């Protein structure tokens, strides 16, 4: 629940390895925050790559939160190139998605000047 959001939000790899050993449990990862943010977006925002790749190996399905932002969008704000390369090599269909107004991942990367 909330501890999962906290731990995945700050790169606690060992705790993640511990508390998502339930393969049949799927709905908890696809949960939402008050803003609907999914752990993927949190780890992309807070500078962490191992956790997001571990969740991706589970098949995170690339959820989209409010304001239309996605995992690549949040990863862009912060210039963490490693998460970009580990999230782009899986699929090229995750670059042209669009947020609530029309900005893409490139828009935000240019905005933050990385």
């Amino acid at each position: 629940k909330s501890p999962l959001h906290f731990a995945a939000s700050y790169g606690r790899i060992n705790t993640c390895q511990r508390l998502l050993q339930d393969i049949s449990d799927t709905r908890l990862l696809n949960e939402g925050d008050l803003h609907g943010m999914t752990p993927l977006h949190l780890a992309a925002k807070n500078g962490h790559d191992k956790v997001v790749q571990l969740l991706l190996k589970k098949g995170a399905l690339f959820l989209s939160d409010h304001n239309g932002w996605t995992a690549l969008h949040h990863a862009s704000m912060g210039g963490y190139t490693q998460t970009m390369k580990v999230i782009l090599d899986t699929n090229l269909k995750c670059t042209d998605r669009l947020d609530e107004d029309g900005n893409t991942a490139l828009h935000f990367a240019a905005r933050e000047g990385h």
Binding site: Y10, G11, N46, H48
Partner: protein, 38 residues
Amino acid sequence: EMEILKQKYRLKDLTFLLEKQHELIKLIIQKMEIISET
């Protein structure tokens, strides 16, 4: 000109140090024994 130039290099060194320190603190959270307040 050379004084502003010196200030620019000192500020570049300061921001490099602060970036390293921020990465270090992120290292601090990513391995923590958060149990009492977990």
